[PDB]
Amino acid sequence: RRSRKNGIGYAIGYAFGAVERAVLGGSRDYNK
């Protein structure tokens, strides 16, 4: 609520979200 959520979370979100991005590339994320 003071920009404290957007500064460190983005870093991890960038590295992680980056690898995850590939996962969300096409589809097949669930369905057993």
Side-chain angles (χ1 to χ4, degrees):
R1 252 97 170 158
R2 264 233 271 275
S3 203
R4 258 257 231 302
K5 289 217 234 228
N6 249 223
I8 217 83
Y10 94 69
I12 172 53
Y14 158 89
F16 206 151
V19 294
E20 302 254 76
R21 252 145 71 159
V23 174
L24 317 168
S27 329
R28 293 91 107 79
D29 197 8
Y30 320 119
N31 205 317
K32 229 195 250 63

